[PDB]
Amino acid sequence: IRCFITPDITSKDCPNGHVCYTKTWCDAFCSIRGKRVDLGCAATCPTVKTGVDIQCCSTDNCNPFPTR
Amino acid sequence: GRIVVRGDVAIAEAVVRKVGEVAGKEVILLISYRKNGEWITYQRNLEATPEDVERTIAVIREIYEESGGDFILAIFSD
């Protein structure tokens, strides 16, 4: 699945992937550097966690760099 | 309206100053750098204030110190 990818904000292909994801969360520098970001592709939509905001979508390049 | 700076810390600082000079419309910054072999990415809003400009400059300098130049600054006028 054609998806945008961190850290270069470029695009990929992922022949085994079926969904683009967008993971945002806080580390010790959230109030200084901002929120952490991870964009990519996966075979399935990754599992939710308590402190991470995850966004999944099943089209080509549906995870642009300006998250929210 | 995209701006990408890779490696040059002084030019990264010169851009962040010009962005926040006069811009009632905020901007979204993407800051990535490599440390200990792992690439780590942040998303930081930049306010038009001179205070938040100073803070962002310091974050660039701190990232440039850790990564040793292996940093990527992308600016989204969003």
UniProtKB/Swiss-Prot annotation, chain A:
Annotated site (Binds to alpha-7/CHRNA7 AChR): A28, K35
Stored Pfam families: Toxin_cobra-type
PTM notes: In homodimer alpha-cobratoxin, selective reduction of Cys(26)-Cys(30) in one subunit does not affect the activity against the alpha-7/CHRNA7 nAChR, whereas its reduction in both subunits almost prevents alpha-7/CHRNA7 nAChR recognition. On the contrary, reduction of one or both Cys(26)-Cys(30) disulfide bonds in the homodimer considerably potentiates inhibition of the alpha-3-beta-2/CHRNA3-CHRNB2 nAChR by the toxin.
Disulfide-bond pairs as recorded: C3-C20, C14-C41, C26-C30, C45-C56, C57-C62
Keywords: Acetylcholine receptor inhibiting toxin, Disulfide bond, Ion channel impairing toxin, Neurotoxin, Postsynaptic neurotoxin, Secreted, Toxin
Compartment annotation: Secreted
Site annotation Binds to Torpedo AChR: residues: K23, K49
CDD domains, per database record: TFP_snake_toxin
GO cellular component: extracellular region
Effect of F29A: 12-fold decrease in affinity for Torpedo AChRs and 74-fold decrease in affinity for neuronal alpha-7/CHRNA7 AChR
GO MF entry, a single one: toxin activity
Tissue-specificity statement: Expressed by the venom gland.
InterPro entries (UniProt xref): Snake_3FTx, Snake_toxin-like_sf, Snake_toxin_con_site, Toxin_cobra-type
Effect on the protein upon substituting A28G: 5-fold decrease in affinity for neuronal alpha-7/CHRNA7 AChR
Family statement: Belongs to the three-finger toxin family. Long-chain subfamily. Type II alpha-neurotoxin sub-subfamily.
Function: Monomer: binds with high affinity to muscular (alpha-1-beta-1-gamma-delta/CHRNA1-CHRNB1-CHRNG-CHRND) nAChR (tested on Torpedo californica, Kd=0.2-4.5 nM) and neuronal alpha-7/CHRNA7 nicotinic acetylcholine receptors (Kd=13-105 nM). Also inhibits GABA(A) channels.
Subunit structure: Monomer, homo- or heterodimer with cytotoxins 1 (P60305), 2 (AC P01445), and 3 (AC P01446); disulfide-linked.
Additional free-text comment from the UniProt record: Negative results: the monomeric form has no effect on alpha-3/beta-2 (CHRNA3/CHRNB2) nAChR. It does not show any blockade of the nicotine-evoked release of dopamine and does not affect ACh release. Does not inhibit the homopentameric alpha-1 glycine receptor (GLRA1), when tested at 40 uM. Exists in two forms, due to cis-trans isomerization at 6-Thr-Pro-7. In the dimeric form, the Pro-7 is extended away from the toxin core whereas in the monomeric form, Pro-7 makes a turn.
Protein name: Alpha-cobratoxin
Source organism of the structure: Naja kaouthia (Monocled cobra)
Lineage: Eukaryota, Metazoa, Chordata, Craniata, Vertebrata
